Amino acid sequence: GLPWYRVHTVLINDPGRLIAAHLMHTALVAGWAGSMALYELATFDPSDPVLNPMWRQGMFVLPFMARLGVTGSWSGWSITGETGIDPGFWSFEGVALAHIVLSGLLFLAACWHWVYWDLELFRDPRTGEPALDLPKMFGIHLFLAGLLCFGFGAFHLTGLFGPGMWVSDPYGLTGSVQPVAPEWGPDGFNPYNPGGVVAHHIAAGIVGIIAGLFHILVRPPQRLYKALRMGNIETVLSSSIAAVFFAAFVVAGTMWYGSATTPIELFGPTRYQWDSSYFQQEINRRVQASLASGATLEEAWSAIPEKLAFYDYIGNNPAKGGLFRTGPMNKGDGIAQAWKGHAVFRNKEGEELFVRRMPAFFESFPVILTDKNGVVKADIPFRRAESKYSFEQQGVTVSFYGGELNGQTFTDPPTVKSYARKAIFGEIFEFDTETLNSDGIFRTSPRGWFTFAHAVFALLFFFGHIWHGARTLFRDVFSGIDPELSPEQVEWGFYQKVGDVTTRK
Amino acid sequence: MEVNQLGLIATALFVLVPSVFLIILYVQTESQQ
Amino acid sequence: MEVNQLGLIATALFVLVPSVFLIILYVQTESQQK
Amino acid sequence: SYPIFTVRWVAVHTLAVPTIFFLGAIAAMQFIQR
Amino acid sequence: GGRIPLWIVATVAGMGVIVIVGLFFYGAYAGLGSSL
Amino acid sequence: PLGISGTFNFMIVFQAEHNILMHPFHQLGVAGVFGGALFCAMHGSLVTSSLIRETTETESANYGYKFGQEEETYNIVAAHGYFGRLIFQYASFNNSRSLHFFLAAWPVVGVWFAALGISTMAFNLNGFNFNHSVIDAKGNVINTWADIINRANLGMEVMHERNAHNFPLDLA
Amino acid sequence: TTGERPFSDIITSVRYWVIHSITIPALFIAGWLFVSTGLAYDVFGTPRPDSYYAQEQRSIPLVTDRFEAKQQVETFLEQL
Amino acid sequence: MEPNPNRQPVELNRTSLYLGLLLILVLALLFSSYFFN
Amino acid sequence: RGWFDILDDWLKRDRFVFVGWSGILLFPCAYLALGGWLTGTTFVTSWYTHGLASSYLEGCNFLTVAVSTPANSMGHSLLLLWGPEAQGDFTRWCQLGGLWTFIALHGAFGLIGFMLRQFEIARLVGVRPYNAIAFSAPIAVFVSVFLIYPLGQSSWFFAPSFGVAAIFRFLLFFQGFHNWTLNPFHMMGVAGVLGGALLCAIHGATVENTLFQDGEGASTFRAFNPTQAEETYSMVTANRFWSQIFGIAFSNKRWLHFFMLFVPVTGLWMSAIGVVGLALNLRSYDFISQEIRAAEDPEFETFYTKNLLLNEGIRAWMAPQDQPHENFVFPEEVLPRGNAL
Amino acid sequence: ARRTWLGDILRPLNSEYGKVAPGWGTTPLMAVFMGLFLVFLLIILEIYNSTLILDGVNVSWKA
Amino acid sequence: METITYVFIFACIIALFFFAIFFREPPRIT
Amino acid sequence: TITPSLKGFFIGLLSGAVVLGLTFAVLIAISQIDKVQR
Ligand code: CLA
Ligand code: CLA
Ligand code: CLA
Ligand code: CLA
Ligand SMILES: CC1=C(/C=C/C(C)=C/C=C/C(C)=C/C=C/C=C(C)/C=C/C=C(C)/C=C/C2=C(C)CCCC2(C)C)C(C)(C)CCC1
Ligand SMILES: CC1=C(/C=C/C(C)=C/C=C/C(C)=C/C=C/C=C(C)/C=C/C=C(C)/C=C/C2=C(C)CCCC2(C)C)C(C)(C)CCC1
Ligand SMILES: CCCCCCCCCCCCO[C@@H]1O[C@H](CO)[C@@H](O[C@H]2O[C@H](CO)[C@@H](O)[C@H](O)[C@H]2O)[C@H](O)[C@H]1O
Ligand SMILES: CCCCCCCS[C@@H]1O[C@H](CO)[C@@H](O)[C@H](O)[C@H]1O
Ligand SMILES: O=C1C=C(Cl)C(=O)C(Cl)=C1
Ligand code: OEX
Ligand SMILES: [Cl-]
Ligand SMILES: [Mg+2]
């Protein structure tokens, strides 16, 4: 009998039931997508895209629907915060329902192909044995993939017959679905240029159409047919697994570093935006431009959008989570309610002091305050007996500009110290920690969880490639080596060329 | 201790689903002629 | 809704334990020589 | 009747020639003082 | 191809290794890396 | 301690107090267990690679061996013909007895030295100490990777058993 | 037994040791001089003992710019 | 309906059962702490 | 036939060192990775990337030399010699850490070449390629630790540097920052490595102590012939011994040797998965229930809370010198310390 | 085996199992496209890496 | 509940030891 | 136009092409001389 890890090899010689098994797998995947969208719709709060967007809420498939133009609900809301929109049938709910119906139809087709496995189509006319012409199948499938790839770029992404795709400004403040024209110059290869995505699918699609026609009409060279074992369906599994782990590494990379197809309003900010103080620099730029135009400090900071400030906060950094800290980011620090405003610390001399921010590497971090030149001026000491820089000795105060606490100043050292502890995380927010019984411990976003699963799966699929590639090229010895294997073929000196009986001396 | 409530069902299915899979296969092996 | 937390494991074992018992008996019946 | 310059010969010397040069360098370093 | 006995080669070659490694240990106590 | 995290606590404190990573007996230990795992995989793969065909394509190849059969179940000449070409011919074990002696000896000797590492650091003969070993012409300390290890060791030392020490040196 | 002369034959022959009584010490001496002349420092850009710091400097010359790094080391080196 | 000639019996011997149950139970003993968190 | 077949002939000749098609990739990349490491550890500093001496030329010994990672400000630059950072300047390239990416990338392609060699030779002599399959574990470890881990972090700077003491630092960083000993994927790696060493020792010792007397010598190694048909040791006696000593024993020699492949290979694959998580700081750092109890109850203490205090020491005491681009200044009063020490 | 209307229509597309072109066929042309593709992947990788920096190609959110 | 879960899995493993040893598939010579 | 890093890219591409070209030219030449005897 077959051991448990080989039960599915009964399909190798049975094209009809292989198709049935593939239909069943497709039904399950489409069924997962539908159920996942429904579960997210049953839990998603659409009322605040500024401080409670989808990526704070553990939403995994919602951003993929939004990325390609599904932004509305039948119940009237849109993820950009609009009310009273008519999405038509293709709301989030319509997408979910369509996937459920597809799952059912695929399931029924699997049953038919399982029962009626013995179709004459699957028999070689000459031999009567089961046979699939894998080279021609590749040409047909590649041609079809080309057509669909071309149409996706030329019609859907352009908006010519379709909705377009998600695009946004460089700071993720005004994202929406737009038509995108293709970019045909060298900037099309810029990962942050959405026009390159359009151009890719047009050009790669046409190349796929041409190559598909080539593989339909030209038979493989005998040299390549034999070397890649093109009569063996397991060779296709080997190279397909290889292509698939290549793809999975690529999407892991573009998710972690960011691109035109992993926008921050859908998946959250990247860790590199914290590393480079990307949002802090833009906030500071706007405030200094406000001041140069004659604004007061309160007006300058009050002109900063809450959404921009919220990106300048480490609790949204995807490199701050934990493998077993499950659920939405809101489960950790809470549901963000409002920006408290920008904290400005000062010592008794009135010098402005700056809290040293926490790097992503550190689960915990001390509170150290420096002047504008980086000289240490205050801290929160561990040992007290030789403290020189305590907030009490240095007379540290904090004033807030913008947000809830605008115009307020605090001098009580425990209160000032409490705000300094928050300032190591960047801008300071008020959180609802009760609704979800949040535990105060940082979690990663969909950007982080996506990256993790796909880098892990990609690595495991490398083993799959190695395994099935080995099975393909060594099929003649899968059960063992030849019992009367020639000892001269493995010893030294008998053959000039290793393993070539025709080169004996 | 404030443990995750889903930890119990997660552990129970983690044990039971693959264990019963093996028991199903073992028993139908024994019953073959 | 504030349901009993043990309701989930109770229902899951209630379904799985006797269902698996029947599946074991069925499969080993099918595998007997015919 | 044996050949002298073989694949083995090259492999030996790509390793052995630098090793002796390096060992001469590291030996000289033992006499560097700050 | 055989004139020099293999045991003398092995002895002489082994002694050279001891000398050169000995020098490296000497250098741990003098000059750079000696902490002095 | 008789526990999982307690084991890690013992290891981290040991590194603080003995710099065990820089001790050659622990390094031999690592060569022992890394090498044991390597040769375990190597021997397993080579014997498995050279099983003589005794089964059909469907059944497990393990059916090709019957407990107590007198014939060896793999062709060691084929395994050594592969491995000798992977490296070079004389680097390979043709003799099964020599091979299996090496499989026993390499991890056992390494782990003996690991045990002796712990048993001699038990009397405070500790790992190599190259803290501030490299000095420039003026006398500035030029750090090496040994000095970074020292900084990590210091963090362990000053924090462990945080209420237990009253005097400045941890002498046991 | 692959057709090459055995190593034991080679390293016990007089011709081998006639050749390598010249080549081995010559390589060794060439490597020595590579260090003793200071050329190793300049090929690899490794500081001499008097070249890690200027006389009153206390800050290490860490590279901080990716694309002007080549020029950054050039400036750190010219301050010595 | 004509019988499918590609069908095969499946086997799991008692040792494989014990090995599998050990794997499963030890994985559970290891991962359960992290599930409870 | 044609030139391809003539070239194939010469590549696959039986010789002292087999070349093969895979050798065209393997030998240059392996040689350059090893040569690069010897070149750097002998002659090359880490002053400009780390503020560290790291070569024999500067006074380091075998334990403390390294080829160190580039400065954090290089990011994940490939740091090609002809690239925009070194612009063809070999000396500047060494000072910038070019040898690190040189070794890591040639090393990776060398590992690809070596595994291709294992397939190619297995195919030529007629054996199943399980050796190549087993080698996928070393490759998963190398790719996850030296490539994926730094690619998830800020730069190559936080990859392992190629040196003995540099690697020890990497271990200690992972304890203090990642609490890596707590990670169940590392624990599976440990079980696979230690269980592999156990299997290695117990199998070798068992064969050697159930040998048949096949000769008259008291030294028993000469009494074996590779072509012999008969087992050289008694599987039946070995099985009875272990059944009575330990309760269970192998009885199938094919299963035994497959299991010896399976155990260390699977362990290394599991550790690679944990490191892929650490690339994103996706750690098994804490147990939330422990932290809630300990925060509210200052008499509650476990070995888990004790180890986090050690990690907090490691981070504060090692980071200023270990991460010089951060310009950390931690005044004495902020450093975590217990009493007296 | 069972013939069907759809099976009879698709039958010619699954009829050339094992058919090959003689010898090396279009292998040289295939190798050319493989080399171009390798250079192409190298190009996009180095642009993403900021090892290849082009006029009007700012690899940043700011573009 | 967590304590019960940990002790239950441990107890199953000990029971498995007993069956794997005393109710093993007996080795038979051939 | 052509940036310095594009020029460097061409230097890398050509350098790699030469190393590969010379390797295969030497190997093919050696293989034609020292033919296996059948
Ligand atoms: C009938 C058509 C159809 C349409 C219009 C959709 C539409 C959608 N799907 Mg559904 N789906 C379908 C069928 C469909 N699906 C089927 C049959 C399955 C089972 C496999 C699924 C399983 C599924 C899942 C699991 C998910 C969706 C999701 C979605 C949404 C996001 C799409 C996306 O990001 O994909 C991205 C697609 C790609 C990146 C394509 C990659 C193609 C690779 C690169 C091809 C390489 C092969 C090729 C031959 C190479 C050569 C090419 C040549 C041109 C050169 C979108 C609403 C997502 C969602 O939001 O769920 C609610 C989601 O998670 N779908
Ligand atoms: C590509 C896969 C993928 C990714 C990246 C996400 C991502 C996300 N999910 Mg989704 N989900 C998925 C597939 C995925 N999901 C599938 C297949 C289902 C059906 C089960 C779900 C059902 C689901 C629900 C019900 C919920 C989510 C939620 C979430 C969010 C939080 C995730 C979390 O806490 O993980 C935690 C991750 C772990 C604890 C890691 C597990 C690692 C395993 C246990 C290791 C196993 C090791 C193995 C035994 C070793 C064998 C060794 C052997 C070989 C020897 C996040 C955005 C949550 C949310 O916020 O929704 C709004 C939520 O409530 N997801
Ligand atoms: C396209 C993906 C793909 C496909 C179609 C196959 C197909 C096959 N595999 Mg390969 N393989 C793959 C990827 C794939 N593999 C990957 C990624 C790996 C590394 C993990 C492997 C490693 C591998 C090995 C070592 C072996 C196979 C074998 C086989 C054959 C029998 C499988 C069987 O009967 O399992 C039966 C499986 C079970 C009864 C239960 C498995 C339970 C798993 C471990 C846990 C639960 C999985 C979960 C449901 C998956 C969710 C989806 C996931 C992607 C998130 C079959 C041809 C076998 C073979 O060659 O036989 C001759 C074999 O020994 N595969
Ligand atoms: C097969 C063996 C092999 C492999 C796989 C590598 C691989 C590598 N080398 Mg190494 N190297 C080798 C042998 C090898 N090398 C040898 C023998 C030497 C001594 C001469 C070196 C000396 C060396 C140095 C000094 C450096 C490298 C570097 C590298 C890395 C970048 C290479 C690159 O971008 O080239 C790109 C070139 C190609 C991809 C060639 C492919 C060409 C295709 C197939 C056809 C195109 C032809 C083209 C159109 C011709 C016209 C050009 C025209 C347009 C100008 C890469 C990991 C760099 C590095 O490691 O940085 C950290 C580096 O600085 N190598
Ligand atoms: C029949 C029919 C119908 C119906 C249908 C339906 C109703 C369907 C459903 C479906 C469904 C509803 C499906 C679902 C699916 C799901 C799935 C398939 C899942 C899976 C999962 C998994 C696989 C997971 C895994 C895991 C875990 C668990 C943990 C973590 C890790 C991982 C992630 C791995 C209609 C009416 C249309 C009509 C026609 C006919
Ligand atoms: C990087 C690079 C390159 C390359 C180079 C090379 C390839 C080099 C090599 C080099 C080499 C190749 C070197 C070598 C060295 C060696 C040595 C340095 C050795 C030493 C030894 C010793 C010291 C010994 C010890 C011992 C042991 C181990 C055991 C016991 C005994 C005794 C203790 C004695 C090129 C140009 C391409 C390009 C640029 C970059
Ligand atoms: C919630 C967890 C659920 C996990 C579910 C796991 C399900 C596992 C399903 C296993 C199905 C076993 O499939 C079963 O195989 C046996 C052989 O092995 C077949 O048995 C067949 O072969 C045997 C042996 O040659 C003959 O004696 C028998 O007459 C014949 O019918 C059965 O017809 C089939 O029903
Ligand atoms: C005692 C000082 C005033 C109270 C604390 C002010 C810092 S800000 C404070 O930080 C909390 C997390 O600790 C958040 O949950 C909360 O929303 C926020 O008000
Ligand atoms: O040379 C060999 C080395 C090892 Cl580890 C083996 O297992 C065999 Cl069979 C031959
Ligand atoms: O107890 Mn446990 O650890 Ca040996 O050092 Mn002293 O004592 Mn305590 O300190 Mn550090
Ligand atoms: Cl004391
Ligand atoms: Mg010295």
Side-chain angles (χ1 to χ4, degrees), chain I residues 220-291:
Chain I
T220 63
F221 293 98
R222 290 199 180 165
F224 177 81
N225 173 25
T227 66
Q228 75 185 52
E230 301 93 4
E231 54 172 13
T232 200
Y233 65 100
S234 168
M235 186 68 180
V236 172
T237 292
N239 166 273
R240 200 205 181 79
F241 173 89
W242 285 113
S243 295
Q244 292 183 281
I245 287 293
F246 189 58
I248 62 165
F250 289 105
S251 66
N252 191 292
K253 282 165 81 169
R254 299 185 163 202
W255 166 240
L256 189 166
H257 285 89
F258 174 81
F259 191 66
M260 287 182 68
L261 180 159
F262 177 88
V263 164
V265 169
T266 300
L268 259 63
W269 266 96
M270 290 310 100
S271 68
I273 290 167
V275 166
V276 169
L278 297 193
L280 316 173
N281 296 331
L282 271 178
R283 309 149 175 169
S284 308
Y285 192 87
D286 47 12
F287 291 115
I288 295 191
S289 60
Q290 296 269 305
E291 300 295 2

Side-chain angles (χ1 to χ4, degrees), chain A residues 32 39 57-60 323-324 326-328 449-450, chain B residues 14, chain H residues 31, chain I residues 270:
Chain A
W32 174 85
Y39 176 88
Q57 293 182 56
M59 298 294 143
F60 187 51
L323 179 56
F324 291 98
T326 64
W449 284 118
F450 183 96
Chain B
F14 188 99
Chain H
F31 275 90
Chain I
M270 290 310 100

Side-chain angles (χ1 to χ4, degrees), chain I residues 24-25 28-29 32 78-82 93 101-102 105-106, chain L residues 12:
Chain I
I24 300 178
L25 176 65
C29 293
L32 290 195
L78 297 162
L79 245 168
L80 311 180
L81 171 60
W82 54 87
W93 187 62
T101 52
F102 183 91
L105 296 175
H106 284 94

Side-chain angles (χ1 to χ4, degrees), chain D residues 23-24 26-34, chain E residues 20 23-28 30-32 36:
Chain D
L23 286 170
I26 300 170
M29 297 168 188
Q30 303 316 310
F31 302 87
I32 302 171
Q33 305 216 291
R34 69 193 181 84
Chain E
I20 193 85
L23 178 65
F24 295 172
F25 272 97
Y26 158 82
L32 303 185
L36 296 177

Side-chain angles (χ1 to χ4, degrees), chain I residues 153-173:
Chain I
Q153 295 290 339
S154 60
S155 69
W156 299 124
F157 182 91
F158 290 100
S161 293
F162 293 105
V164 166
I167 278 282
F168 299 156
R169 166 265 170 201
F170 190 78
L171 310 173
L172 300 181
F173 184 105

Side-chain angles (χ1 to χ4, degrees), chain A residues 340 415 418-419 422 428-431 433:
Chain A
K340 296 205 178 194
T415 300
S418 170
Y419 287 124
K422 304 307 166 186
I428 303 171
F429 286 75
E430 183 202 333
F431 294 85
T433 59

